């Protein structure tokens, strides 16, 4: 072993399984051991691990899933889509945090909010998995981003965790001290989301009509779905069914009549 | 998932010890336990508090306290943990084999747990329901340093181990674990690191 | 509605003519008509057409300045707080815009037209329940939008030095009242950090102005350093390692985005204290305390930089040691150090590096540094004593252990003869024994306190004047009040013999010195109750055991 060379194209030092304990500085290396390697060998890589960023470990190249990517995914154009990858790394970090507070949780009788955290975690991990692919349309990207940010900041909220701003594109543009007032109004908008969710926890977690009115105040057009199953009537002749919406108080119809042809055999014609 | 499964079940111990410390915390906080045939003005509720030192139990005939454990010197503040032979569960409890005035009926077949001590003294106690009965038995077996006999304990084992490995495989996304481990490339016998260490 | 046209009107009209027409029209507003509405009006005005500024900003703003300065203090600003805040927000934002146009000199015009103004505003606008946070955001956005050269150009170059002195004092009391009683939810950590950075910048600037107008340059009127260090240290009393620790990246997040602000804060304070020079001694005993905590900081490096300041100030006293020595300094040191450490602040590594640094500093120096060596050896003893105390406190949490260790440190102090903190721990142990209802023990403690007291009239030291109540309290009065309470405890302690013993002497003091016979009557009334109790009833004999620890 010799010939180690400093480089910064290894930020994703990827394990393959629990590594053998061959090195004095290596162990049964955990699956997601994204290690900040410092030095390059052809078959091996030694550097900082995520578990201990102050320790080295020489790890096989056949074991490293080499990723030239660094903390920035646009310089090497590693982005599956620009402006979205920051979100996946940040949410992975928050998942680490969620697991830590999870350890903090079961030891205490917070099982209700514990399970609520559980379901939020399931939703987040599945959203993460599906958006790992960029196959979703741009509208889906925006909607996923909005709802995942809402859920994640809510999770921060009831756990008393600090919050982030810049709703879209990595939530990082605003905290980049670009402005100062725009920062304040961003914090205010986020705290507005907070107050929304704290008042609506008792509104949706308990009741179901307030969410309906809130969603219906965002859209103006609606569609009633009617799925006919079978006509139970004793006619013996051809029947025409004029299905429509009607206003009993106004004594008039609200939708155009839908014509159904019914046969004399008990079956539709 | 065969390497995945072997890796998951192979790094067991952390969750096991984790769960058992959770168990012993539950034992320490405890609650009011249940006696035998506490009907004619007998306080069926009574707290059994483990020491935060986890060596002595604070228990005895305390009042019918709905609040549960109350911090004070119980009727007996010692259960000698170093000489508990076992706790019998079910028909092995002799108090169920009682056929006189202390006849326990057939609805407490799963709430029977008698702590063995003094080689003749026992503690035939009842649990409000099965889950915490198994919980207390798990905690005591942890004091015995042994296996856990709560179904909920196996539930936690499985769910948390599965979560933990689940949140590990994010690094291997779009990658595969060879069932045969990758060959270890030859390491040159010299350790003369051309670059400086650390 | 009229702002709605300004965009395309500009698109087909002279920019500056439009500008001046709108200016004259707004000036045509009579001074008491529809304030909020016009505020919204020029809000929309500064919204657009302010992308092109060099021809309008310099002429639009003067008007805005005039009306906002009217909004400064007319005793009827109550309706316009939120609206004026909105205006400030929008204008400061569009000024923060870079591509819009060059404004640095116009930023200055804003300085000299708005800065003292908003300062006086927040002075009046001083309540926290309202939307004060918006104003705070506006003023910090101002302060970060500035430049040090800016800060200097006129705000540092005002009229007579008295005015600027008063202004600086007002700013400093403001900053202290801001960092203290913080205005944020404690969740907007980004806001807290940014506010810290900008306050750091501003206090830096006001530090250089203090240097360049108020050092021996201003040979006199040199008090305000008390306020300045107060504010600085208070600013150095949050956002510490543990809050930084919550997530491991939390340390990393802050150090990447901001670094350890505390580091340069302490370095600035250090070099400033060095800069004080001849005024150090005139300024030491008060500010002795304010530096321990920054020395106590859980970090390493600025501590390494900060302990030497202790030798520097005892050196300053050594220059003054022609009359006495640093007895004054070391007394405050001991007192403070005691209460901070017992506050659960220090750690042993601190003590080791303290000893190292002070000893090394003393070695290069003379006899008085040897006296400092022996006193700091005493200090190290105190440090290890307190550390043992606190580790047992946090380790056992039993009444027995905590009383044991506090009695140990009590005896230690009695040896060290710093009677005041000795009394403090006396009262601590009193609290403990009362919590255990050990009336006998508690009353004995109060007795030990009263032992040092005399029946004289003159209150000889305010050291015996405690925090429970504080006024004249003639030595006689404090002694008798203590005795009274001790008697109460013995009575509910069922030990009436000692109650009688002290009742006698309370009575004789009444007779020979105060002649207040009503106290006699009540005192001996209780005395009779005591004799009745003792002959009449019976009480159990406590058992005694021998405990051999091995």
Coordinates of C-alpha atoms in Angstrom, one line a residue, chain A residues 165-166 171-184 186-187, chain C residues 96-98 141 144-145 189-191 193-195 197-198 201 253-259:
Chain A
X165 CA -37.0 29.1 3.7
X166 CA -36.9 29.5 -0.1
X171 CA -34.6 26.0 0.0
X172 CA -31.1 27.5 0.1
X173 CA -31.3 30.6 -2.1
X174 CA -32.8 32.7 0.6
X175 CA -30.5 31.6 3.5
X176 CA -27.6 32.6 1.2
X177 CA -27.8 36.1 2.8
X178 CA -28.8 37.6 -0.6
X179 CA -31.1 40.1 1.1
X180 CA -32.2 41.0 4.6
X181 CA -35.8 42.1 4.3
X182 CA -36.7 39.5 1.8
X183 CA -35.3 37.1 4.4
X184 CA -37.6 38.5 7.0
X186 CA -39.6 34.7 3.9
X187 CA -39.3 33.8 7.6
Chain C
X96 CA -30.4 46.1 -1.9
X97 CA -31.1 45.3 -5.6
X98 CA -27.8 45.3 -7.4
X141 CA -31.2 45.7 6.7
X144 CA -26.0 45.6 6.6
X145 CA -26.6 47.8 3.5
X189 CA -32.2 30.8 13.7
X190 CA -31.1 32.3 10.4
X191 CA -32.5 35.6 11.5
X193 CA -27.4 34.6 13.1
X194 CA -27.8 37.4 10.6
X195 CA -28.8 39.8 13.3
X197 CA -23.5 39.4 12.2
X198 CA -25.0 42.8 11.5
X201 CA -20.5 44.9 12.2
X253 CA -23.8 24.7 9.3
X254 CA -23.0 27.7 11.4
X255 CA -19.2 27.6 11.0
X256 CA -19.5 27.3 7.2
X257 CA -22.2 30.0 6.9
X258 CA -20.9 32.3 9.7
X259 CA -17.9 30.8 11.5

